[PDB]
């Protein structure tokens, strides 16, 4: 098996991952914004960017925001949602958490959230986190509430890619 760095390099060559902002580097101990993760998902799952539509009210969520076409694509696909449903705030510069990433990936991979999940996750996420751990996307000791490291995100994305590639329909 590949190291995390090798998985990063493979996903970067494939156009799925980028360097930490302002770099081309793996920076495996750093964290990742929800905007960046939306782009990962689009690339990972072959989603279509959506230009000229804005489903959120965040300040500076507009045509000049590079991430909007990706955020809109993951929104249309049902993978990501507002952080604050009432204010329709996506929190694009907020950091993606382990449990948020788990929900995205479980949903994209059509995995069933675990009924009666018992774990550290926030209530809404227990079933998703559980399903993600059971599927090997995150280790059992990951803190669901924590910001995911780039290592964790590389390892999860790489595993989701491998799973998805087991359908003859994979892009
Ligand atoms: Cl989300």
Author numbering: 28 to 198
What does the paper say about this structure?
Prokaryotic cell envelopes often include proteinaceous surface (S-) layers composed of self-assembling subunits in porous two-dimensional crystalline lattices. S-layer anchoring is best characterized for Gram-positive bacteria, where S-layer proteins non-covalently attach to the PG layer via species- and strain-specific non-classical secondary cell wall polymers (SCWPs). SpaA possesses three consecutive SLH domains near its N-terminus, followed by a large C-terminal region presumed to harbor the self-assembling domain(s). The crystal structures and binding analyses presented here of P. alvei SpaASLH, SpaASLH/G109A, and SpaASLH/G46A/G109A with synthetic SCWP fragments provide novel insights into the functional contributions of many conserved SLH domain residues, including SLH-Trp13, SLH-Gly29, and SLH-Arg43, which precisely interlock from three different SLH domains to generate two active binding sites.
